[PDB]
Amino acid sequence: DFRTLPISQLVAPYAKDSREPSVMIDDKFEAFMANHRRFLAELGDVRARDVLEPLMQLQHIDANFAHEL
């Protein structure tokens, strides 16, 4: 299937790159990256019920979707 571009694909070219950035990392950038890591972890936590329960609640107000289901 099709998804948005993953970051690992974009940082793959720097796999063997052993370099130090010119600009020293500051506190705000570190907090930004920590928040991003938290969001990325939260992204991959979708269970089956998250999709299935709303469908079996919403089928009770529309008959065409119940037919489809």
């Binding site: 099709f2 930004f32 928040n35 990325l40 992204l43 991959g44």
Partner: protein, 196 residues
């Protein structure tokens, strides 16, 4: 379809079904974005990308994005992109309900920061591509959903009948610019990204 119709159009049980629809829409958006495992020292690689972009380094190995993808269907990808855009538009509209505002706002801000991170690397790749000469063996890169459907959703939300939707639409642009400034370090070289 039914979830969007139920959410974005207005008994005593309506809030229950609206909550169910919102949950479904959020789950579908998360599934469409996808899950990724990034390296441990990602900040260093991001700053290396920024350094390469600010200069014009020609030693970037982008052979991974020169491989043709000649097995999938382009039309299917277009349809998926349109579906994701519809989902984002519904999420933006959801800001007009006081009980849903905080959740959708947090989710949208997180998505905007994620897409800024994507755009920086896309800029590096595009800068490197402009110098490569012609070659018959080479092809285009992989197929993916364009993360610039957010721009179209924001465009379609800027003239909404509700003030909250317009304010959120403006706040998203502000947030993306602020994230770009934070990642770069200073606002000097931010206008060099191809997103603007």
């Amino acid at each position: 379809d039914l979830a969007i119709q139920k959410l974005t159009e207005i008994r005593q049980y309506d809030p229950y079904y609206k909550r169910q629809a919102l949950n479904l829409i959020i789950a579908q958006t998360k599934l469409r974005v996808g899950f990724d495992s990034v390296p441990e020292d990602l900040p260093r690689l991001v700053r290396l990308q920024v350094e390469d972009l600010v200069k014009k380094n020609r030693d970037v190995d982008i052979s991974l994005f020169e491989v043709s993808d000649k097995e999938r269907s382009i039309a299917k990808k277009n349809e998926e992109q349109a579906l994701l855009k519809r989902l984002l538009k519904a999420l933006l509209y959801a800001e007009s309900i006081p009980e849903f505002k905080q959740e959708v706002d947090a989710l949208l801000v997180n998505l905007a920061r994620h897409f800024t991170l994507i755009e920086i690397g896309r800029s590096v790749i595009d800068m490197k591509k402009a110098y490569t000469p012609f070659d018959t063996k080479s092809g285009e890169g992989p197929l993916f959903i364009d993360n610039r459907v957010l721009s179209e959703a924001i465009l379609e939300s800027l003239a909404n009948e509700n003030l909250e939707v317009r304010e959120a639409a403006k706040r998203l642009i502000k947030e993306m610019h602020n994230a770009a400034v934070t990642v770069f370090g200073s606002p000097m070289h931010v206008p060099r990204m191809t997103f603007w």
